[PDB]
Amino acid sequence: VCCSARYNLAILAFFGFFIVYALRVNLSVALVDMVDSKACPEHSNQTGKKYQWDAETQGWILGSFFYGYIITQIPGGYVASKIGGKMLLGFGILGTAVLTLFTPIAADLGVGPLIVLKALEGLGEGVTFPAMHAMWSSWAPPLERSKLLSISYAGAQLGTVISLPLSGIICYYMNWTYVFYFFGTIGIFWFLLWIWLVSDTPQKHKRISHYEKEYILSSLRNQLSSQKSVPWVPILKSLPLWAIVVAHFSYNWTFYTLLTLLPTYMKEILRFNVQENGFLSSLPYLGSWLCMILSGQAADNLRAKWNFSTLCVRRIFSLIGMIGPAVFLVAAGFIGCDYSLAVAFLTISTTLGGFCSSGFSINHLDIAPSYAGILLGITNTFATIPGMVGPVIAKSLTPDNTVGEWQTVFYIAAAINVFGAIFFTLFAKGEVQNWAL
Numbered sequence: 001v002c003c004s005a006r007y008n009l010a011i012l013a014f015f016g017f018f019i020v021y022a023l024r025v026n027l028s029v030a031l032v033d034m035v036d037s038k039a040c041p042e043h044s045n046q047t048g049k050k051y052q053w054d055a056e057t058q059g060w061i062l063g064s065f066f067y068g069y070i071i072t073q074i075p076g077g078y079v080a081s082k083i084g085g086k087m088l089l090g091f092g093i094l095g096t097a098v099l100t101l102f103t104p105i106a107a108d109l110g111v112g113p114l115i116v117l118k119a120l121e122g123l124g125e126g127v128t129f130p131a132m133h134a135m136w137s138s139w140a141p142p143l144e145r146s147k148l149l150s151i152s153y154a155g156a157q158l159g160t161v162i163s164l165p166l167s168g169i170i171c172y173y174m175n176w177t178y179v180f181y182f183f184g185t186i187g188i189f190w191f192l193l194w195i196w197l198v199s200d201t202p203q204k205h206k207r208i209s210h211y212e213k214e215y216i217l218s219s220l221r222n223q224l225s226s227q228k229s230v231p232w233v234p235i236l237k238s239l240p241l242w243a244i245v246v247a248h249f250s251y252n253w254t255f256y257t258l259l260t261l262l263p264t265y266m267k268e269i270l271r272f273n274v275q276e277n278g279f280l281s282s283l284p285y286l287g288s289w290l291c292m293i294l295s296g297q298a299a300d301n302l303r304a305k306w307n308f309s310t311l312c313v314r315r316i317f318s319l320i321g322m323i324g325p326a327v328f329l330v331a332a333g334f335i336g337c338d339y340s341l342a343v344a345f346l347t348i349s350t351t352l353g354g355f356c357s358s359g360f361s362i363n364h365l366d367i368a369p370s371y372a373g374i375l376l377g378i379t380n381t382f383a384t385i386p387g388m389v390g391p392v393i394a395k396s397l398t399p400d401n402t403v404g405e406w407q408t409v410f411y412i413a414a415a416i417n418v419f420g421a422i423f424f425t426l427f428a429k430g431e432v433q434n435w436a437l
Contacts, residue, residue, distance in 0.1 A: 097187020250420020
């Protein structure tokens with residue numbers, strides 16, 4: 001029932017991730033109005049002051065977020081597994097939402113303060129995904145993980161879906177600064193709700209029913225660890241974890257391509273101006289969100305009714321969500337000058353990538369539930385490298401900017417995706433490892 005305690009936590013986490021991603025992606029679409037301004041046959045007021053920022057300054061402003069996001073992944077996961085994930089997640093999203101309120105001031109102070117503000121946002125926000133895994137490690141029954149971790153993380157996709165047009169509408173009807181204030185006060189209200197309505201374990205919940213707490217505890221009974229000391233050497237030497245690391249790296253490289261280079265491909269080759277309606281940039285994330293939810297529910301229905309193994313379901317959904325994007329990404333390079341088919345292939349790739357919300361993205365809990373925060377921190381410290389090294393690759397592989405070099409970039413993305421999917425399918429596991437007991 002949606003009124004349950006675990007599902008209420010899942011809904012509140014959905015909204016938390018929604019708000020944090022809406023805060024993250026609102027700068028790229030509000031930066032256009034705060035700065036001071038041949039393959040296809042060229043298909044194709046405001047208040048406040050404008051800053052003179054070239055492309056390099058905007059790139060360093062936008063990309064400096066991940067340089068803090070990559071630092072507090074493993075420390076955040078460790079602290080979350082030690083003390084609990086509620087306060088870590090709440091205060092991370094609160095730091096993101098309260099630093100946003102100061103962005104109109106940090107901008108006017110200079111590029112230095114803006115880069116520092118984005119790095120502080122990254123530092124505070126890097127701890128939210130490991131904290132959410134370390135929270136579900138005590139809340140999600142083993143046969144309910146694909147549902148809850150899909151409803152929880154589906155906030156990011158709807159977060160972008162809502163942030164891209166709504167922030168533009170706010171910046172059109174009003175000043176550009178009113179984006180940050182609006183999303184910041186919304187994040188503050190969500191933090192006020194999160195502190196009140198959630199607890200980091202079912203035992204520490206003050207409203208949970210007795211039968212539900214007993215159900216959750218007896219389901220997670222035979223999977224929790226009794227070491228109380230993190231086995232770093234078995235974790236690092238475990239091949240089923242490096243399988244998730246390789247898969248997650250490959251998937252984040254492929255989606256960095258699909259969601260940063262492909263809209264740039266349609267601008268520099270198809271001349272499409274990807275939005276062209278405002279909502280065409282949100283449709284891919286919308287399909288991705290819907291597919292995330294539906295694939296989580298389908299994976300859990302499989303594991304519960306049809307008696308599929310956990311490993312078999314992880315393999316199936318990872319193979320789908322990592323070969324679909326690659327296959328539809330290779331074909332997107334052959335599209336010539338058809339902008340509509342390019343947007344269709346982008347949407348089909350981003351939609352089929354929602355299946356991975358029940359693939360490797362949950363396998364951190366299936367192989368080591370009591371240490372899922374540290375495992376997700378480890379797999380996210382590697383997976384945020386494609387988001388920051390990728391730009392160098394795209395800028396060094398397209399000096400002439402022809403269709404051939406873009407096809408080469410798409411081939412590299414697809415090869416990395418296929419290698420990641422095959423490596424995961426080969427070396428992944430779905431049962432709690434012996435070092436996690």
